[PDB]
Structures are given as C-alpha cells and as structure tokens.
Coordinates of C-alpha atoms and ligand atoms in Angstrom, one line a residue:
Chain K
X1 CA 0.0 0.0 0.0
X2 CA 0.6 3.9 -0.6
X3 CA 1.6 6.4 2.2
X4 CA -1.5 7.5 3.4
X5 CA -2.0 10.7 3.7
X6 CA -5.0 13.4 4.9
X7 CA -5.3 16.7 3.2
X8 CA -7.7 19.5 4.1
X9 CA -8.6 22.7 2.1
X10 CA -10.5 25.6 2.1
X11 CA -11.1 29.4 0.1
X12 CA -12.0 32.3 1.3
X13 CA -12.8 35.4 -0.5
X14 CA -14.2 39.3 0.5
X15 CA -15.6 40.0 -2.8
X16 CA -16.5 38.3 -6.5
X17 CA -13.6 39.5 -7.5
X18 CA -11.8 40.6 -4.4
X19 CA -8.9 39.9 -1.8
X20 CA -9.0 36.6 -1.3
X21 CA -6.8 33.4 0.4
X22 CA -6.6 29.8 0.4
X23 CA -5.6 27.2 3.7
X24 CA -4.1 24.0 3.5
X25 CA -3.5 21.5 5.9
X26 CA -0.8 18.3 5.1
X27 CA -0.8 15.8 8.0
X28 CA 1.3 12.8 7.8
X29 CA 1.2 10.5 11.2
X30 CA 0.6 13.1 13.3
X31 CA 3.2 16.1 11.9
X32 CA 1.2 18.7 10.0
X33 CA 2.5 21.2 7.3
X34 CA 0.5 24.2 6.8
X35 CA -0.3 26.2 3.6
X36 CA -1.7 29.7 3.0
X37 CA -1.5 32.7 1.0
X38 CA -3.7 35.6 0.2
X39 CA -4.1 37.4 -3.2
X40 CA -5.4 41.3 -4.0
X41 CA -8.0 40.0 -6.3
X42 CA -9.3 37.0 -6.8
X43 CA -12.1 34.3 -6.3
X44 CA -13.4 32.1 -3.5
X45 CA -13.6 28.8 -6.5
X46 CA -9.9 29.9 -7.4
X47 CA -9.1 29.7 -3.8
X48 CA -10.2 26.5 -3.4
X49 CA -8.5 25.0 -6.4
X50 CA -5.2 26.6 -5.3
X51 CA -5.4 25.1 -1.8
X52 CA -6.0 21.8 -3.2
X53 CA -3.2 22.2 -5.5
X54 CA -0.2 23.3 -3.2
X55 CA -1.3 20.5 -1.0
X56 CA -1.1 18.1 -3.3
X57 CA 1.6 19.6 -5.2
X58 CA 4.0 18.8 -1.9
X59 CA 3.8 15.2 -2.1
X60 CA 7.2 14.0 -2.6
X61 CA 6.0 10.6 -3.5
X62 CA 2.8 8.2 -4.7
X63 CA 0.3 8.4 -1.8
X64 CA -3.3 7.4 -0.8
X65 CA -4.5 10.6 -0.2
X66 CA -7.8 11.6 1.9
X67 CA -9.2 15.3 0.5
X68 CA -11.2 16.7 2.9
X69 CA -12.7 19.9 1.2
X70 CA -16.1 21.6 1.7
X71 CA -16.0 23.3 -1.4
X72 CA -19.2 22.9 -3.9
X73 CA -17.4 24.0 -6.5
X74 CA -14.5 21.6 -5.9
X75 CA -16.9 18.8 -5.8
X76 CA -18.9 20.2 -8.8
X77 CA -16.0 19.8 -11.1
X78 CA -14.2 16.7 -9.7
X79 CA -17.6 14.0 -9.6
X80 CA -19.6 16.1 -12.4
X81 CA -17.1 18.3 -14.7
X82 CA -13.5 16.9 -15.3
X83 CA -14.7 13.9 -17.3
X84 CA -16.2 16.0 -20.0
X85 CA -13.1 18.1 -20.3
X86 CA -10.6 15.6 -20.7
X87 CA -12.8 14.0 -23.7
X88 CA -13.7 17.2 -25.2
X89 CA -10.0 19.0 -25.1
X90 CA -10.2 20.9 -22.0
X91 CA -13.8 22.8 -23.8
X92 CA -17.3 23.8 -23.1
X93 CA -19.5 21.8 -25.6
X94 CA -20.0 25.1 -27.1
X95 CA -15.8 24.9 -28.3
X96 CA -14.5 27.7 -26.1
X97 CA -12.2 27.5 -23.5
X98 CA -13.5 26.7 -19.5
X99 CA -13.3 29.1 -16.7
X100 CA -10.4 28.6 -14.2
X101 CA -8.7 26.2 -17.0
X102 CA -5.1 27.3 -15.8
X103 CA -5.9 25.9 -12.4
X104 CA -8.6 23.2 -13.0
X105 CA -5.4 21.5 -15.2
X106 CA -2.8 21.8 -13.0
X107 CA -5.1 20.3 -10.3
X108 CA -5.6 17.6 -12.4
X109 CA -2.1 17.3 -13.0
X110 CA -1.4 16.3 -9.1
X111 CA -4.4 13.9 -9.2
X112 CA -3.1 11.5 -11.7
X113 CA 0.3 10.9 -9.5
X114 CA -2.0 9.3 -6.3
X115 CA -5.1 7.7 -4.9
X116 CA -7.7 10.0 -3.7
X117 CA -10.4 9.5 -1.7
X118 CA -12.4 12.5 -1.9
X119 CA -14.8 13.5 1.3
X120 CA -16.9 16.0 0.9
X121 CA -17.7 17.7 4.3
X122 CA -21.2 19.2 4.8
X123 CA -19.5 22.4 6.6
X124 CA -17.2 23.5 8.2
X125 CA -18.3 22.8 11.6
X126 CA -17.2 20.1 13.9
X127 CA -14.1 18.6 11.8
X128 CA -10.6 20.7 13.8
X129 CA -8.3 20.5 11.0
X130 CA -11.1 22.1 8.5
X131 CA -11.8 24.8 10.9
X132 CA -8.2 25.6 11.0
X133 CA -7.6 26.1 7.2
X134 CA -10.4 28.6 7.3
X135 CA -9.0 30.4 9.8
X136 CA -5.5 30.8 7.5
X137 CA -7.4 31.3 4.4
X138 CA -9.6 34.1 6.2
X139 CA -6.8 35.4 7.9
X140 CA -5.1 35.4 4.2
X141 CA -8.0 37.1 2.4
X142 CA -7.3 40.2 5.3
X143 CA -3.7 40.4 4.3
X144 CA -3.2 39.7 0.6
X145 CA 0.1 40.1 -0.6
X146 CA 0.2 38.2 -3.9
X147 CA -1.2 38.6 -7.1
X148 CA -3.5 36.1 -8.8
X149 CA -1.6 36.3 -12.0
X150 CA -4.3 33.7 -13.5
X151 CA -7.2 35.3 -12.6
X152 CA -9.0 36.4 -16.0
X153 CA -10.5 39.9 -14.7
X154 CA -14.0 39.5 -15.9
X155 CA -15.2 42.9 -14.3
Chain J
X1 CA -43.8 64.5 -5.8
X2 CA -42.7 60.6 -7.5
X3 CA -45.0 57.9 -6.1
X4 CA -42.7 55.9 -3.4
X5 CA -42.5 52.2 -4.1
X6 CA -41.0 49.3 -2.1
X7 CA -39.3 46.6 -3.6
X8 CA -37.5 43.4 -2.0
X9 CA -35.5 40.8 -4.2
X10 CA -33.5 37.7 -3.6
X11 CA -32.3 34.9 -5.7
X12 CA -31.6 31.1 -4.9
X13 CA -29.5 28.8 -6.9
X14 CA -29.2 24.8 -6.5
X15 CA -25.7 24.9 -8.1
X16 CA -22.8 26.9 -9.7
X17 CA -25.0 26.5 -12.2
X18 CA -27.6 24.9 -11.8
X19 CA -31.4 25.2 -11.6
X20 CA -32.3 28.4 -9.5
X21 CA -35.1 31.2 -9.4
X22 CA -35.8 34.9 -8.3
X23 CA -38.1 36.3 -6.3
X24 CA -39.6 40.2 -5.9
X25 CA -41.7 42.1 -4.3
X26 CA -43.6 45.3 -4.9
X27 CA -44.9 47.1 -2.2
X28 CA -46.8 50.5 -3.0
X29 CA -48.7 52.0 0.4
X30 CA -49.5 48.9 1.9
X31 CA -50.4 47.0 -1.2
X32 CA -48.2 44.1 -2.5
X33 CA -46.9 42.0 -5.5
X34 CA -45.1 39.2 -5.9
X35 CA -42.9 38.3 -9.1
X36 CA -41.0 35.1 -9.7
X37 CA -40.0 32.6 -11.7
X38 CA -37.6 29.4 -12.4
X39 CA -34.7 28.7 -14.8
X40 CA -33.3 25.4 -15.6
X41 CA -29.3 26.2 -15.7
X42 CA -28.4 29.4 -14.5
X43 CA -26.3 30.7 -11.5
X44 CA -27.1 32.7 -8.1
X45 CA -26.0 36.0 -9.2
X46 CA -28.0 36.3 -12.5
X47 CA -31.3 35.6 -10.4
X48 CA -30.4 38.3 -8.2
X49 CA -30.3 40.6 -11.1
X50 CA -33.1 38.9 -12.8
X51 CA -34.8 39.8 -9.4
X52 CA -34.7 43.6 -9.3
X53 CA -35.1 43.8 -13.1
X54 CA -38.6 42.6 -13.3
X55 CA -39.5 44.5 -10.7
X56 CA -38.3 48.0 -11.6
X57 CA -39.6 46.9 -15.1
X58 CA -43.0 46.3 -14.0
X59 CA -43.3 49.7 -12.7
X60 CA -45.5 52.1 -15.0
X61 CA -44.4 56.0 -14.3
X62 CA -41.5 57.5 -12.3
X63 CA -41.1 56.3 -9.4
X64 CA -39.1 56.4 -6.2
X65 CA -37.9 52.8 -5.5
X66 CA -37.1 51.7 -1.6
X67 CA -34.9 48.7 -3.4
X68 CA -33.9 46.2 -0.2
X69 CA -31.8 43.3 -1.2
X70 CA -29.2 41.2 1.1
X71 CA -27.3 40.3 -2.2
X72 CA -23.7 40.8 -1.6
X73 CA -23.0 40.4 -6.0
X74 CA -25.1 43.1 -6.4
X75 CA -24.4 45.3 -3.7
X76 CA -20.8 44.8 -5.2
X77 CA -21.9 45.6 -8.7
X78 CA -23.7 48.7 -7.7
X79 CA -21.5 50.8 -5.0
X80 CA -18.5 49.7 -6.8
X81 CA -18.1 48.8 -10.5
X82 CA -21.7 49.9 -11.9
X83 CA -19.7 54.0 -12.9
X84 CA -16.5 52.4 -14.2
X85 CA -19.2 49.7 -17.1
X86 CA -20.3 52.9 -17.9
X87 CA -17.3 54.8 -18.7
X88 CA -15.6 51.9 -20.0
X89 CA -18.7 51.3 -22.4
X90 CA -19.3 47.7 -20.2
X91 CA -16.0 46.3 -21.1
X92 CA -13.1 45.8 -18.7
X93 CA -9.4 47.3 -18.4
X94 CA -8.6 44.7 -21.1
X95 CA -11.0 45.7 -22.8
X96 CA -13.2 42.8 -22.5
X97 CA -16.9 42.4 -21.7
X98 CA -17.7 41.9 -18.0
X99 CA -19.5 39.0 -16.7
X100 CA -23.2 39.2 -16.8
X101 CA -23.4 42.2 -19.2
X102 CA -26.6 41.6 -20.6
X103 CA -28.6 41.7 -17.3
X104 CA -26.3 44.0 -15.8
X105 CA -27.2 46.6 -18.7
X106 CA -31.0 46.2 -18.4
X107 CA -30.7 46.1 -14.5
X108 CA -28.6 49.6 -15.5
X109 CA -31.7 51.0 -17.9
X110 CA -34.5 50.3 -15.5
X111 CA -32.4 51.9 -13.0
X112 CA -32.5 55.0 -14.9
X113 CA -36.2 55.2 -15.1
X114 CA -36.8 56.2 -11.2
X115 CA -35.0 57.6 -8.5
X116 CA -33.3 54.5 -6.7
X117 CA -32.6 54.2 -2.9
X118 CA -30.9 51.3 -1.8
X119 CA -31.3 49.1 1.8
X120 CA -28.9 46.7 1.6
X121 CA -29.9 44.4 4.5
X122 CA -27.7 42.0 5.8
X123 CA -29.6 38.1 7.0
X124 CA -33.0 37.2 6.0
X125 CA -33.6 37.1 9.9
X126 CA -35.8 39.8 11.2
X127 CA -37.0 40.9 7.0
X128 CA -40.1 39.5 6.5
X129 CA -40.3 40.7 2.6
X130 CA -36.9 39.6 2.1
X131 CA -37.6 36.4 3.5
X132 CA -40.6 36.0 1.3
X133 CA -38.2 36.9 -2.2
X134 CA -35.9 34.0 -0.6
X135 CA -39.1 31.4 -0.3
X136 CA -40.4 32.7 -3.7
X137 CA -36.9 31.9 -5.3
X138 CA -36.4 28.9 -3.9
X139 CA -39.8 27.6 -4.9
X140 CA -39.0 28.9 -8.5
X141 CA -35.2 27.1 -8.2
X142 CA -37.5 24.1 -7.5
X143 CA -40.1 24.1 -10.4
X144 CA -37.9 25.9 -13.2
X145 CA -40.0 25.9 -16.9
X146 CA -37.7 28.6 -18.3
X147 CA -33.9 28.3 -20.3
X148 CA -31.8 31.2 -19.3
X149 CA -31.0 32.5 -22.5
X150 CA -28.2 34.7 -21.4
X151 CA -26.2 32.5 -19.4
X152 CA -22.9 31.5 -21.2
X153 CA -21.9 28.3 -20.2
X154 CA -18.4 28.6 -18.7
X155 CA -17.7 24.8 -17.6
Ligands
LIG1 ZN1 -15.2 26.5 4.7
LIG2 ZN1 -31.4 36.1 0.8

C-alpha cells in the first residue's frame, strides 16, 4: 500500500472578484504542514482549487491521499465536470475554452500521481483541522500580498 | 412628488450552475406583488439581477424605488463597478466584456427610469419581505420551466 495521507482545504474570498486566500493542511502520522497565502484580487472557486493544488503539489512521493474539502465547486467539477473536459479538449461543448482552466489542469495534473479519496464535508463545523484552514485562508484574504496572476479579470 | 415604491428581491440557486429562481416584491402603500420565476441552468448572481429587473420593469411611471436586497454580488456591482461599465462602455481594463453584461445593462436601464434608494440588508432574519423573495426563489429554483438564455456556459 501507498503512504496514506490526509489533506484538508479551504477558500475564502471578500468579494467576486476581491482579496482573497486559500488554507491547507498536510498531516502525515501526526506532523502537520500548513499552507496559505492571500491574493489582491481574486475568487473564493480559485481559492479552493489553489489550496487543493499546493497541497497536493507537496507530495514528494505516490500516496493514498484523503481530500477533505467543503467546497461545492470543488466537488462540482471533480464527480460532475472533469470527465467531460478531458474527452472534449479541456472545452465547453459550445468549443470555447473553461473558466479557471489554468488551475482546474494543474489540479488535475497532481491527481493523476495518487489515490484520492475525496470526502466531501457538509460544513465547516465540527471537523478541527477544516476549521483551521479557514482560519489561515480568512486570515489570508485580510492580508493579501500576492497577485493572482491567472485570474482572468471579468469585471 | 414621484410615487414611493418598495421593492424586496432575492435569488436562490441549487448549483454553480444549476437550476435556480428569483423572487420580488412590490410594495406600493401597503399593497403588495409578488414576481417570480424558475430557470433550468443558471447561476445565483444572474437571479439576483433577474430579481430587481422585473420588478423595476414592472413599474409604470417614475417612481421612487425603496430597493432592499441582502445580495452581496449586487451590492458589489452597484457601489462599486456599476460607474466604471459605464465609462468603459461595459468592457473591462482589457477591454473585455464583463461578466453578466446583458442583465447588468438592463438592470442599469431600469435603474434609470426612477430615483433609486438602496437598503442593503444584511440576513434574512428579522425581514419578512426579504424572507418571502428568498421562499419565492427557492420555490422557482424548485419548479424551473424557463432556459436562461443569457447565461454562457463557462464549464
Ligand atoms: Zn469552509
Ligand atoms: Zn437572501
């Protein structure tokens, strides 16, 4: 069997577009590794995709990985979207290019190097370590200092 | 003087998209009327401008419009970017058309038909109108019979 491995995630965002950050937590038999950064303008989706991606993106090896995330829109395109983009060449059905491709593929990217067992948590609420990536990716949204240089400004 | 009108309006969407609705209310001394209907793939936002469109559109003279919504996208859209579509001709720095244009442009020409003053209120606790747009949008979300023609689909 893989390393297993539990990953947690979360977005936050102030505005649609606005300042926005993501939280990540990496937890390997007990140690944790933390991720967060917070961006001038972004979106809460974006946020979400990022903090799956840096988490993922920091597996130095094939693992069994538990995604705790309780992101609609991460679930949206994981169990209902990314199957239709890979057969139609990352396109709508109308032929033009999706929204959040730069980060929808490079999510996809770190998927196809492990196992992933997707739980989708109702809220929030209850679960520690998904209260705590909220907290960094709040805290983040309060005190952006990056650039989301793949956000498409659509305002 | 302009005959004083209330109006509330909410929206409610079952995804990102998805089916969703929009529910208003007109309120002229005491009186009121209800609009709403139910789309079969649209998003949140665009039924919270669908919302205040058919009711400022309903209205028959000059008015002056008590317009109470707990929408944060278009409390964004109004106190911040609503002067800048204008003056940019409702494209963006990039010179690109923003994101809803179509019913962000007919929200911006029944807007100019009376003199508009906003309440944004924040919960649906404690607003009885504003809880009633909510329950008429949801039941709209939950029997749509219309195509939202306008939506460009972005996944
Ligand atoms: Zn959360
Ligand atoms: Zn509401």
């Amino acid at each position: 069997m893989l390393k297993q491995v539990e990953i947690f995630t979360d977005g936050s965002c102030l505005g649609n577009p606005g300042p926005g950050g993501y939280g990540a937590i990496l937890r390997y038999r007990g140690r944790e590794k933390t991720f967060s950064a917070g961006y001038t303008r972004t979106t809460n989706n974006r946020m979400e995709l990022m903090a799956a991606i840096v988490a993922l993106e920091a597996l130095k090896e094939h693992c069994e990985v538990i995604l705790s995330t309780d992101s609609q829109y991460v679930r949206q395109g994981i169990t209902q979207w990314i199957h239709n983009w890979k057969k139609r060449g990352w396109k709508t059905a109308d032929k033009k290019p999706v929204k959040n491709v730069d980060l929808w593929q490079r999510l996809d990217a770190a998927l196809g190097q492990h196992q992933i067992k997707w739980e989708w948590v109702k809220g929030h609420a209850g679960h520690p370590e998904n209260e705590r990536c909220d907290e960094l990716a709040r805290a983040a949204a309060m005190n952006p200092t990056l650039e989301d240089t793949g956000y498409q400004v659509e305002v």
